[model samples]
Target chain A: RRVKLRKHLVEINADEITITLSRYTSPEALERSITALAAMTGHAPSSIKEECVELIDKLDWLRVENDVIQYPTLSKLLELYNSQNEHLSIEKLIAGLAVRRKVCKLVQDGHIDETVYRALDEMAAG
Target chain B: RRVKLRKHLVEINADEITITLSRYTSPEALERSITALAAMTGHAPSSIKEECVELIDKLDWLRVENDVIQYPTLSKLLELYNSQNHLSIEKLIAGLAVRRKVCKLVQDGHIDETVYRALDEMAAGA
Candidate 1:
């Protein structure tokens, strides 16, 4: 259920070590994967599920959509930035400028929302 | 440097009040009645010398001999009580019946140093 596997993942589960990785297509698959991973590491499935739930709580901006955790849309980014500013550090906000730039490029390419870029500009100008 | 004084002190320093009090048979008329019977209504000097120096740092056993602080025939309540049985003796001090009696007497006596010493001795005897 952990988003990222540790380096010793192969050592923990030598079987199916090279299984093709793919986004979970359903909640049932995610639950099964959590149980298998927990069994490999001698951890409770409930604990693994709890860890995954906590991770999603912190990164709900990148929600699972069409079997993939989608990047933030312009409106979502603007909403998240304003609504969750209290929980974020100024340093972290400034550090995220790199991603903001990527999002800007996405806006120019007509991939991401133009409103998100406008929100960023308005915030910076303010 | 406080111990007692409060209770309207007879309508706050009414002139020519009947003042027949004794103690400190030798110390500049006990420094002009702690300055008199408006004196008692306010506060104590030197905070009763820092509450008799924090009640001789929690009862020094045999302090203030012939106008001096002293106590405990032993060379001080063993550092093992500190450097060793720290937790055990902390609980011992915490659970001491004498502590309850001392606190009760302190409250009853309005934090009076004289009454405290008297209560301490009485509790020890009991």
Candidate 2:
């Protein structure tokens, strides 16, 4: 009930596919849609989401020596999303979390400036 | 695009949870997830698993003793991961948990490079 899905679960379910996250995520209304899609895919959105959440556990590994914004260029972002518009929201969702995490870190440290916030929002303002 | 998920991913989601080992996991769940990796790796476990086992053996002084698998209380584990990032112990176990799936992709036999790369990342942190 709490182990490898590919192990016993694979044996139990004849239909399944393995996703290798060379590494390593959505919301409410988004959740309903993903759930529906997963039913068709035979993967409970909950299962995939659980994996997603688990991957997040390692999120701290991504931190660098500094607290800079570190936002990537559009070209890099596109490469990450593989130019898939469907993943645009997914990538963006992850992006926002990464930014906010830093922001909070900065907040606690009482550091950084507004530029970081604007960069995240893509809004050109002070 | 490549860094700590919290630094970038947390800002946008208002509902995200920040987990520390002190607040993460249940013994029953942890054991089963761990047990799953062994079965998935089959006759040969991943290198990271080996590393974790190595640590587990070295920590023999801490365990009450179990030939099969010795379960340590959180205090003992707290000492290990906190020895460095204080987050790595979770990474070690999670790394072990993750390797099973990596090995599963090897199909209890697909033993190749993925295990190395994935766990390479794991060991990098630990």
Candidate 3:
């Protein structure tokens, strides 16, 4: 019924890091990721699927081919997460925290860019 | 950056009814609907936005009109809610319930038209 978040790291270069959100190749992996997120948040996998799928679809930079979802800009999100120390909320954990905060602030400050933050706000506001 | 859910009712005959989902119109309506859902949910506008946008994009029968979202099937959803105890046929009443339990159930696809159709038929016979 619902799918999971599947990500791949594409680059580890010092100057640039790349992470890709990929479509699930296997239902088992998809189910595992769904279960992992649900367990982490004490939310149902279905609920977790709602948020993750939203991010996957709304984020324009994400590349979708043949109805498959993938995104390259997600590296910034992970980088933002590693920068934070506090245990974040489940939504923050999977969606990534610092990135959301930074984006929220940008929207607050009236600075809307072409970055993922733009989609974040729309999805967040919806 | 965000898309809205567009719905069209095709038939309203006493014997049979049909509805269709189409893409969006003005981003303004999308934004307003998002605000409405947010206010109803008591979660951040962004958070509530997350759920509505998810439903818009996820439901397969919905058609994408010029990258806009329209779902004719939504009439079924609306009709189901009206037939249930909840009155006043709000655009997103059941799906955008303020309580997490109800909202999550919707996001999880628990309260679908099929379930409602069965209940509605049972009620009619009774």
Candidate 4:
């Protein structure tokens, strides 16, 4: 069966962060995916972190989970949240923000290499 | 760009076998993929060797080159060649034939469980 990805958006007010959690489903569900995200993002609330975790309690069939965080969005959100308290270009706080970018281009460019040798061995030897 | 596999069929009158060579082109091509196949198919015939080695002197953008040898076809061809002939499907011959049959089943079922995992790791790491 074809696997499907499910997405959940969580907004952390104090950190001014909006995390988009994408999880796969059917024949490939994941358990403890949320806990895993928690480990990555931590519990810190201005840190503006994007955490994508699974909410399911089972792992029957899970394919892939993607965590996407927008630095620009976070910076603007932080400025709006801090409103007049302090004006910083995100340099005053946070790393990988100003220069962070998505890797869609690299991935879409066929930068990934696939080799079928190992499986071929089994098919040949067996 | 769409990659077209160029197939060249060569009949070895000595081995009494026909080998089909396939070649591809691309920006993300494999360099000297010939050596890779040499390690797999070995240097035997009827051992109905379907050696699909490349003749190209350059590598720029090769997608995938599939080495497909028909076992039943080979068996029959071998019988024709080795006639007057002895007839014995050695265990290795049977094994190779088994691989051909099972692989077709597995491929149609999409149960190849190696290439994608390695591919994902490369994508994540890079």
Candidate 5:
């Protein structure tokens, strides 16, 4: 599902965010899904953050607890929540964002350069 | 601009895949765009491979020459050619696929585990 995102869901309010969660294996694989009841803006009622998460969550790398999903921080959630690609991989997507923002310190000895190469290896070996 | 993809475009018939290219900046930023004239059957006449390459090339990470984009292998193109998200990074996305396929070793000494943690630190420190 291609969508233009809005700060649409998980109720990113004052204290914490809530995901409004689902199960690991009901109505589907032994996998979990996260959904939102609605999104009012961000183009209004289009899609929510949780649905986006589950699209990638096809792997179940994350967890949902008692109808709520946990996130370490907005940034982390944002990071996981950034972009999706079937072939490109989220790491490249993360890197691409940095590249777009000019935040990817190409200066030698920067953390990202070496780190990107690490990703490079996996692409080659795996 | 959302689309369901098909094995459509770049004419991957035998060897040499040509991109049908453009400059890094023409009607826009010093940004380059790759596009296709048509897509006939990844669902037919919709979007093509070149257009797919470009969405991520928003960072201008890859190169295009004389209306042709070069891909080292189908895998690389496929890598950049997956899904997209504005909030979730692509690395996590790459991981999500492995998780879905159960391809990741997840066992000790596997390449993915340490690699994922390294991304973890980047997210934490950055």
Candidate 6:
């Protein structure tokens, strides 16, 4: 029963689409929603959420390293991200920010330069 | 407008809950809704759904191995399941059932034993 809806929600029902919309009243409500989603589809949303957080973490890394909030491959990485059950880490988010600062310094100090920065940026954070 | 909303939706909007309720009148309606969501936020729904389908395959593999039709790690395996945008494979589900038959042969004799089979059953199909 759960799996059926998931099949519909994520695949056939969602080809060529851009985003999925869901409603939540609170944290507990959200959690229940995820659990119920997993239950319906015979999946573990906790793991998927962990995977999502992981991708966000990777995005955080890209953000910090590039000091830019956007990336093209980001969606790809995030595609791999939303599959885990763990929580996203604020510390990781902060660390990604820290890397962003480092990226700026590396580029400015001539330890690296804009040409190099641009290349790296386009690969991950463009 | 978009990124903020996505961040909220995937990571914070829901958790621990087993079911998420949605109201869809029809296929076209669902597609439009997803489109509107992507436009509202800045993500491509097509990409996220691809990730969700990838996980379902692994579950299908596990199912084919054992006929009992239940697994504890299925929850764990499924935890990694919902991150893709691809569709679930009914063959994998059916394949899982076929593998379940193999399991019976492996267990029918004393070499594997029904007792050892019990462990296999619990780890994956409890």
Query: TM-scores for all candidates?
Result: 0.20, 0.21, 0.20, 0.13, 0.16, 0.21
Show where candidate 1 strays beyond 4 Å.
Answer: A1-29, A60-100, A103-126, B1-126
By summed lDDT, the worst window of 10 consecutive residues in model 2 chain B runs over B7-16
Q: List model 5 lDDT by residue over B1-126, tens digit each.
A: 233222211111101011222222223211111111221122222243344455334432121122222323222323333431112232333332234222232222243545445435433431
DockQ each candidate and list the results: 0.01, 0.02, 0.02, 0.01, 0.02, 0.05
TM score of chain A per candidate: 0.32, 0.27, 0.29, 0.19, 0.19, 0.22
Q: Which lDDT tens digits does candidate 6 get at residues A1-126?
A: 222122112211222122221211234433433343333234567774563333323322223333443433333333333343222322222233343555545433435455433434343432
Interface RMSD of each: 42.0, 13.1, 18.3, 22.0, 18.5, 11.6
Candidate with best lDDT: 3
Complex DockQ, candidate 2: 0.02
Q: What overall lDDT goes with each candidate model? A: 0.33, 0.34, 0.36, 0.27, 0.27, 0.32
lDDT tens digits by residue: candidate 4, B17-69:
11112222221212222222222234342222222232322212111225453
TM-score of chain B of each: 0.18, 0.25, 0.30, 0.18, 0.19, 0.22
Classified by CAPRI criteria, candidate 3 counts as incorrect
Backbone clashes for every candidate come to 14, 15, 21, 13, 37, 64
DockQ of 5: 0.02
Compared with the true structure, what per-residue lDDT tens digits does model 2 show for residues B22-120? 113344432332333333333233542453333333322111122112234333433543454423334544554445455344333343466546645
lDDT of 3 by residue, B38-126 (tens): 33233475774565555555543222223322233344555665655532222243223223443344444577555565434433431
lDDT (C-alpha) at residue B125 in model 6: 38
Error of 4 at B29 (Å): 12
True contacts kept of each: 0.00, 0.00, 0.00, 0.00, 0.00, 0.05
Model 1 RMSD, rounded to 1 decimal: 27.9
The best-first sequence of candidates by lDDT reads 3, 2, 1, 6, 5, 4
